[PDB]
Amino acid sequence: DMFCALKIKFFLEIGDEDAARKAAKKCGYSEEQAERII
Amino acid sequence: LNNIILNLRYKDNNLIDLSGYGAKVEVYDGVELNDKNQFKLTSSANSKIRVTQNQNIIFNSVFLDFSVSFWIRIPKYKNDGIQNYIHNEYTIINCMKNNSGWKISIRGNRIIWTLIDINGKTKSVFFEYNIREDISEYINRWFFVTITNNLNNAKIYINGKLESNTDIKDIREVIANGEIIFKLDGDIDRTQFIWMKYFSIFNTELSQSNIEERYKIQSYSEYLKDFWGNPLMYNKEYYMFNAGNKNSYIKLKKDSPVGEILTRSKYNQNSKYINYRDLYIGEKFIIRRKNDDIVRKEDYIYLDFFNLNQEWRVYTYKYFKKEEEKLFLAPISDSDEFYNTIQIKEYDEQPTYSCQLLFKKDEESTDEIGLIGIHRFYEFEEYKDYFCISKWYLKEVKRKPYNLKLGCNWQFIPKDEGWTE
């Protein structure tokens, strides 16, 4: 859960907005609330 | 061939002479020993070794022709004791009879060899290492000394390479059969000590080639070493040093699971005489095993570090797109999107304290993902160094001679009583 959150920021940190989005969807986040994170 | 006349080595919590000439060796209780053949001379009065040599053999009966070799690890100066360090000479090994013989002494950053003949004539040769380097190869790190003597010259070699030479043609008979006393002797701090290892005396002038061969033989280990030259250990806290980026260190990026690269702070106070970059900085790493705690070449490991309270782990994303990528620094997990397994390597064939860190898809796979290193990433837009994985290193590390300055060359720095900052 915390790990998943970090995995998302890692993907943001390396570019690849896509993997960030995918991980967020799996992690439990909102499709829309994922747009804000990014 | 049969040129060894003293061969002081460890056996059964003691030091003995293995030369076969049966020197009597008395290690007093104040000498610390370990089974890595290291021994410590301290300021305490019972910290001494007395060697009584065979008194019926003379090995240089007509002309001077002998050598001494040993490894040594000399602690860094104390920042508040620099004047004494610079100026106070202390003997560490003395071999004299009737005011003639030889001695090895230290004055601060200088190690000194001295001959004294029967007429009292004195000659010395010394090696002095810089105490203003950002990163020293010598201060508080194990290094290899060999001194040779013939009719004409006294030479000191360091790690197999010739450093200095003194003309000693005007030296006459030197009495060589005195007791050999290993003991700190001089105006020393209570805290002063020296470590030594593999002390040997030879009855001829060793050639540079011979010396170089012994350097490699005595350096060789199946295990890897730390920054100080000691065996690398599992479950031991380490700072990390990068041989291609000497003044750089790793720190967890603020609110991001990556390792940013920062520049080492340096000696803060105001002595004209010294300079160095700090070593006890950056994340505290720890190596975990995937019967002893020694890390050996080809071992599979986890590279962990402490993030405040938690033990976190160093990963590489399985599917990074370019030749290099930021490593993922995160809690311990069995995630299927990241590789967590590292094989520790030694690609250098020559002695070194550097090691290399290889990610593979799997232990039974020969498929190589990349080596851990440092890379300049562009991300206003700016350049910024990161703790990385890189495929470029994979071919780099096979080139001969080995490139000591590749950013995939790492060394591990534990807290050590011989380095204070």
Point out the domain boundary residue: B208, B226, B244: B226
Query: d(Cα B151, Cα B164) in Å, to the nearest integer?
Result: 16
Domain interval for residue B139: 1-226
Same domain, B240 and B366: yes
Given CA atoms B412, B39, B208, B107 in this order, what sign does their dihedral have?
Answer: positive
Point out the domain boundary residue: B210, B226, B242: B226
Helical (H) or strand (E) element with B70: strand B66-73
Helical (H) or strand (E) element with B217: helix B208-219
Q: CB of B320 within 8 Å of any CB in chain A?
A: yes
Query: Which residues of chain A are within 8 Å of residue B330 when distances are taken between CB atoms?
Result: 3, 6-7, 10
Tokens of B180: 């050999």
Same domain, B302 and B360: yes
For chain A, the domains span 2-37
How many alpha carbons fall within 13 Å on the CB side of residue B346?
20
Which CATH number does the domain housing residue B274 bear?
2.80.10.50
Same domain, B202 and B242: no
Q: What angle do CA B75, B283, B130 make, to 5 degrees?
A: 30
Same domain, B141 and B276: no
Given CA atoms B365, B370, B359, B136 in this order, what sign does their dihedral have?
Answer: positive
Same domain, B201 and B234: no
Tokens of B224: 């890897």
- The pairing of beta strand B237-242 with beta strand B410-413: antiparallel
In angstroms, what is the C-alpha Rg of chain B?
24
Query: d(Cα B149, Cα B171) in Å, to the nearest integer?
Result: 11
Same domain, B318 and B345: yes
Same domain, B204 and B306: no
Which of B214, B218, B269, B277 lies closest to B36, judged by CA? B218
CB contact under 8 A, B257 and A13: yes
Question: What is the number of other CB atoms lying within 10 angstroms of the CB of residue B175?
Answer: 16
Upstream peptide bond of B257 is cis (omega within 30 degrees of 0): no
Same domain, B178 and B256: no
Expressed in Å, this structure's resolution amounts to 2.0
Q: CB of A31 within 8 Å of any CB in chain B?
A: no
- Name every residue whose Cβ is closer than 8 Å to that of residue B2 and which is 6 or more positions away in sequence: none
Same domain, B142 and B247: no
Q: What angle do CA B410, B414, B418 make, to 5 degrees?
A: 120
Same domain, B141 and B266: no
Of residues A3, A7, A14, nearest to B320 (C-beta) = A14
Same domain, B220 and B251: no
Q: Where are the beta strands (DSSP E) in B119-236?
A: 122-128, 143-149, 153-158, 161-167, 180-186, 194-202
- Total domains in the fold of chain B: 2
Which CATH number does the domain housing residue B201 bear?
2.60.120.200
Point out the domain boundary residue: B203, B226, B249: B226
Q: CB of B126 within 8 Å of any CB in chain A?
A: no
Same domain, B251 and B341: yes
